[PDB]
Every structure is written in C-alpha cells, then in structure tokens.
Design an enzyme around this catalytic site. Structure first.
Site, PDB file in Angstrom:
ATOM      1  CG  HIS A 180     -19.352  -4.677 -23.200  1.00  0.00           C
ATOM      2  ND1 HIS A 180     -18.087  -5.025 -23.633  1.00  0.00           N
ATOM      3  CD2 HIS A 180     -20.142  -5.759 -23.416  1.00  0.00           C
ATOM      4  CE1 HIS A 180     -18.119  -6.269 -24.085  1.00  0.00           C
ATOM      5  NE2 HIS A 180     -19.354  -6.731 -23.975  1.00  0.00           N
ATOM      6  CG  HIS A 183     -16.103  -9.227 -25.735  1.00  0.00           C
ATOM      7  ND1 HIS A 183     -16.824  -9.644 -24.637  1.00  0.00           N
ATOM      8  CD2 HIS A 183     -14.822  -9.611 -25.517  1.00  0.00           C
ATOM      9  CE1 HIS A 183     -16.009 -10.272 -23.803  1.00  0.00           C
ATOM     10  NE2 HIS A 183     -14.788 -10.257 -24.306  1.00  0.00           N
ATOM     11  CE1 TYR A 185     -21.830  -7.025 -29.228  1.00  0.00           C
ATOM     12  CE2 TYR A 185     -20.313  -7.598 -27.466  1.00  0.00           C
ATOM     13  CZ  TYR A 185     -21.258  -7.974 -28.394  1.00  0.00           C
ATOM     14  OH  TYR A 185     -21.620  -9.302 -28.434  1.00  0.00           O
TER      15      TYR A 185
HETATM   16  C1  LIG Z   1     -23.543 -17.167 -22.855  1.00  0.00           C
HETATM   17  C2  LIG Z   1     -22.458 -16.121 -22.739  1.00  0.00           C
HETATM   18  C3  LIG Z   1     -22.784 -14.765 -22.674  1.00  0.00           C
HETATM   19  C4  LIG Z   1     -21.805 -13.785 -22.544  1.00  0.00           C
HETATM   20  N1  LIG Z   1     -22.196 -12.470 -22.417  1.00  0.00           N
HETATM   21  C5  LIG Z   1     -21.255 -11.519 -22.198  1.00  0.00           C
HETATM   22  C6  LIG Z   1     -21.649 -10.195 -21.903  1.00  0.00           C
HETATM   23  O1  LIG Z   1     -22.869  -9.846 -21.762  1.00  0.00           O
HETATM   24  N2  LIG Z   1     -20.659  -9.284 -21.732  1.00  0.00           N
HETATM   25  C7  LIG Z   1     -19.329  -9.615 -21.818  1.00  0.00           C
HETATM   26  O2  LIG Z   1     -18.472  -8.726 -21.646  1.00  0.00           O
HETATM   27  N3  LIG Z   1     -18.943 -10.886 -22.059  1.00  0.00           N
HETATM   28  C8  LIG Z   1     -19.883 -11.835 -22.235  1.00  0.00           C
HETATM   29  N4  LIG Z   1     -19.500 -13.128 -22.383  1.00  0.00           N
HETATM   30  C9  LIG Z   1     -18.102 -13.498 -22.108  1.00  0.00           C
HETATM   31  C10 LIG Z   1     -17.921 -13.956 -20.663  1.00  0.00           C
HETATM   32  O3  LIG Z   1     -18.021 -12.859 -19.746  1.00  0.00           O
HETATM   33  C11 LIG Z   1     -16.556 -14.619 -20.441  1.00  0.00           C
HETATM   34  O4  LIG Z   1     -15.539 -13.622 -20.644  1.00  0.00           O
HETATM   35  C12 LIG Z   1     -16.314 -15.833 -21.352  1.00  0.00           C
HETATM   36  O5  LIG Z   1     -17.429 -16.729 -21.251  1.00  0.00           O
HETATM   37  C13 LIG Z   1     -15.008 -16.562 -21.056  1.00  0.00           C
HETATM   38  O6  LIG Z   1     -14.915 -16.915 -19.674  1.00  0.00           O
HETATM   39  P1  LIG Z   1     -15.262 -18.419 -19.153  1.00  0.00           P
HETATM   40  O7  LIG Z   1     -14.252 -19.339 -19.804  1.00  0.00           O
HETATM   41  O8  LIG Z   1     -15.114 -18.294 -17.644  1.00  0.00           O
HETATM   42  O9  LIG Z   1     -16.682 -18.739 -19.577  1.00  0.00           O
HETATM   43  C14 LIG Z   1     -20.443 -14.125 -22.501  1.00  0.00           C
HETATM   44  C15 LIG Z   1     -20.134 -15.510 -22.576  1.00  0.00           C
HETATM   45  C16 LIG Z   1     -21.109 -16.490 -22.702  1.00  0.00           C
HETATM   46  C17 LIG Z   1     -20.714 -17.948 -22.770  1.00  0.00           C
HETATM   47  O1  LIG Z   2     -16.218 -12.988 -25.675  1.00  0.00           O
HETATM   48  N1  LIG Z   2     -17.224 -13.885 -25.568  1.00  0.00           N
HETATM   49  O2  LIG Z   2     -16.887 -15.213 -25.550  1.00  0.00           O
HETATM   50  C1  LIG Z   2     -18.496 -13.528 -25.497  1.00  0.00           C
HETATM   51  C2  LIG Z   2     -18.883 -12.186 -25.485  1.00  0.00           C
HETATM   52  C3  LIG Z   2     -20.212 -11.713 -25.410  1.00  0.00           C
HETATM   53  C4  LIG Z   2     -21.298 -12.538 -25.702  1.00  0.00           C
HETATM   54  C5  LIG Z   2     -22.591 -12.011 -25.681  1.00  0.00           C
HETATM   55  C6  LIG Z   2     -22.829 -10.679 -25.348  1.00  0.00           C
HETATM   56  C7  LIG Z   2     -21.768  -9.844 -25.069  1.00  0.00           C
HETATM   57  C8  LIG Z   2     -20.489 -10.346 -25.107  1.00  0.00           C
HETATM   58  O3  LIG Z   2     -19.551  -9.475 -24.796  1.00  0.00           O
END
Ligand SMILES: Cc1cc2nc3c(=O)[nH]c(=O)nc-3n(C[C@H](O)[C@H](O)[C@H](O)COP(=O)(O)O)c2cc1C
Ligand SMILES: O=[N+]([O-])/C=C/c1ccccc1O
Length: 363
Positions: A180, A183, A185
């Site tokens: 990761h 975002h 982190y």
């Molecule tokens: C509830 C939620 C949790 C997410 N957790 C992560 C995560 O653990 N790691 C990450 O890289 N992105 C995380 N994201 C981002 C998603 O992987 C994804 O990139 C984002 O939702 C946009 O794509 P979508 O329009 O298909 O939802 C999260 C998004 C949501 C909505």
């Molecule tokens: O970019 N996002 O819309 C969410 C990112 C995200 C959300 C929760 C935990 C890890 C993540 O990378």
C-alpha cells in the site's frame, strides 16, 4: 469485442478475467488482537469469482495500526485466521492478494503500542480523521494524532516489518502481496514532498523520497519472488490531504521506471478518491505503459465500458472495482450479463457485522 472476461497472467498466477476486487477496509476484525474472522472469510469466499481479490489493508506490525477493526498479519493468531480465509477462497477456485500497509500518521495514539504518537517521515499532523471504536464497539471518526518523525536508525526496522509480513503472507496462503504505497499512508508519506520535510537520505530529492518504498520492494522480492509482488500508488492528485508535489508526473515516472527494473507482478494505479478529480491524460497513460512491463490495474470510479476502452487501447490490463464489489459478490457475472447492480448501503461500509457485508445477494 469484450476483453474483460479473458484471462490475464499476473506474475505467478493466472486470473481468468480482468474484473478485480479492489482493497476495501471494512473494520470488522476482532479486538484485542486485530484478528480476521470466519465472517470475513465468508465475505471473501462470496467474491471468489473475481479475477483477483485484493484484501482489505492489513497491518505489517502493531505499530502499523491506524484503524480500530483493521486486521494484522504480524501475530501467530492472525496468521492462523488468515490461513482459514485463504483456504476458503481457494476451495472456491479464487485468487487472493493481501494488501499490506503501515498507516503512519493516519492513526491515533490510543491504538498505538504504549499509547504513543504514531510515526511518519516528518512530525506533521495529517489533518484528517481515522476510525476508532467507541465503548460499544461501533466505528467512530476521530482526528489524527500528530506523529513523531522516524529516526534514521528506525528505517531498517520498517523495511524488515514489511519483509516479515510478506513471509507471514506467503505462509498464510495468499497468492500475491500488494504494497500500500497510496492514499497518504506511510509509504506515500515518504513519497510526497507535502508530508516529507526530511533532510537526510529519505527526503528532499525524488530519489530520496522513493528510497523507502524501493527498499521495501527489494526486501519483499528477496523474501518471496518479484512475480508475487504488486504495488498500489496514487501518484497524481491529492488523497487524504497528501498531494504529490510540484512535479508529480515526472516523479511518478521515475518511481515507475525504478519499479520496472525489479520485474514485479503489477502496478495498481488509484486514479482518484471518492470525491473525484481530473482524469489521467492519455499521454500520461502512454508514458506509464512504455516504462512498465508488468500488469497495470486501473481503479477509481471505473465503469466496465471505461475499462474495456482502456484495455482495448493497450493502456491497462485490468480494472479494480471497489464499491461495486462491496455490493455485488457476483460482479463478474453481472458485468458479463449486463445485469443491474445491487443497491449500495454506505452506512455499513465501515464496522458492524454481517448486515451490509455478507447479505448482498447474487443474481
Ligand atoms: C469502504 C472503502 C474502503 C476502502 N479501503 C481501501 C483500502 O483498504 N486500501 C486501498 O488501497 N483503498 C481502499 N479504498 C479505495 C478503493 O480500493 C477504491 O480505489 C475506491 O473505492 C474507488 O473505486 P470505486 O469507484 O470502484 O469504489 C476503499 C474504499 C472504500 C469505499
Ligand atoms: O482512496 N479512497 O477512496 C479510499 C482509501 C482508503 C480507505 C480506507 C482504508 C485505506 C484506503 O486506502
């Protein structure tokens, strides 16, 4: 012609389709111990038709924790619980990668070892919120704690924690690991000039800012194999108050050229957060594509049609869907059949139990 339902070699494994499940933090692990559960196992098993499942972000260490309810992959109990989960996915003929993180400054002292300030590149508050749990175990959003800057002599330990977590992940039966590096982190905190004001070999120049993530990549390739390693980046735009600095495109291409030298399985580009932003230019996509010779996964408010367009243009290989995968366990079949998608219930994205987690139906 449609290409979403054709196979793809992703390093050491072969995905039967290009419809991937994005990493999704759901905050349903057991505390104490940050332990995955059989409920989580059921959720992943339901989604095993995905070309590849990428897990929720998972801690490399206790220090890595920034969210109450996020699982780890550092303890014996965590390894044992994940082994059951991967076995279940494999019993359903799926493939699963573990996304490994250190949250760095997107964290709170109350959930750190010893109740101490979380760590980062520099002592700068993230100016955002993380998710804790209240006295009843429910998810609550809480302002982030100002971090402590890592000392130079602590950096090898961070690299070792990623390496160790990858040893554990291989043992736990994951098919691949995703670092990761997106975002806002820890890895992204070092990459970005906005969060990294260090004046040692881990800050300043882009070479220095990328040094940590490249040391991590090299360590994990050596632990396992390069064809087992993916990386998620969000190198264009702003994510959780972390921008990519004043030379974001050039700096991204530097990092990507470096990653290509390691022959890693994939590059996963998170293109936007949920609030959206300017699309990637086709010129930028072309510059990435000519520099990287593994799989490219695009993500961020995609549609099947956009994925097909970009796959047809030879610019990406696969798409990761986030929210549509929360709500549609059989997203592959639905996209293949052009069926409607289940209505999403955002109130149950974070925390809770089976409701809004394992109760979204198949066709
Ligand atoms: C509830 C939620 C949790 C997410 N957790 C992560 C995560 O653990 N790691 C990450 O890289 N992105 C995380 N994201 C981002 C998603 O992987 C994804 O990139 C984002 O939702 C946009 O794509 P979508 O329009 O298909 O939802 C999260 C998004 C949501 C909505
Ligand atoms: O970019 N996002 O819309 C969410 C990112 C995200 C959300 C929760 C935990 C890890 C993540 O990378």
């Amino acid at each position: 012609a449609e290409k979403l339902f054709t196979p793809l070699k992703v390093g050491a494994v072969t995905a039967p389709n290009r419809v991937f499940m994005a990493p999704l933090t759901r905050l349903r692990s057991i505390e104490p111990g940050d332990i995955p559960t059989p409920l989580m196992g059921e959720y992943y098993r339901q989604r095993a038709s995905a070309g590849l499942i990428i897990s929720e972000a998972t801690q490399i260490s206790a220090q890595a924790k920034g969210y109450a309810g996020a699982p780890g992959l550092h303890s014996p109990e965590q390894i044992a619980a994940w082994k059951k989960i991967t076995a279940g996915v494999h019993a359903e003929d799926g493939r699963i990668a573990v996304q490994l993180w250190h949250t760095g400054r997107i964290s709170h002292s109350s959930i750190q070892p010893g109740g101490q300030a979380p760590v980062s590149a520099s002592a700068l508050n993230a100016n955002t919120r993380t998710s804790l749990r209240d006295e009843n175990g429910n998810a609550i959003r809480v302002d982030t704690t100002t971090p402590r800057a890592l000392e130079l002599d602590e950096i090898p330990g961070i690299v070792n924690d990623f390496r160790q977590a990858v040893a554990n992940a291989r043992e736990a039966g994951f098919d691949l690991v995703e670092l990761h590096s997106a975002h806002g982190y820890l890895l992204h905190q070092f990459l970005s000039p906005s969060s990294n004001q260090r004046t040692d070999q881990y800050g300043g120049s882009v070479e220095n800012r990328a040094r940590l993530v490249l040391e991590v990549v090299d360590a994990v390739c050596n632990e396992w194999s390069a064809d087992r390693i993916g990386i998620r980046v969000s190198p264009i735009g702003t994510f959780q108050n972390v921008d990519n600095g004043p030379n974001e495109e050039a700096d991204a291409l530097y990092l990507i050229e470096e990653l290509a030298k390691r022959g890693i399985a994939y590059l996963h580009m998170s293109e936007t957060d949920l609030a959206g932003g300017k699309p990637y230019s086709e010129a930028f996509r072309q510059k990435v594509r000519e520099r990287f010779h593994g799989v490219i996964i695009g993500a961020g408010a995609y549609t099947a049609e956009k994925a097909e367009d970009l796959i047809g243009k030879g610019l990406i290989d696969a798409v990761a869907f986030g929210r549509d995968y929360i709500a549609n366990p059989d997203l592959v079949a639905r996209l293949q059949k052009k069926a409607e998608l289940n209505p999403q219930r955002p109130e149950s994205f974070y925390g809770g139990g089976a409701e809004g987690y394992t109760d979204y139906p198949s066709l």
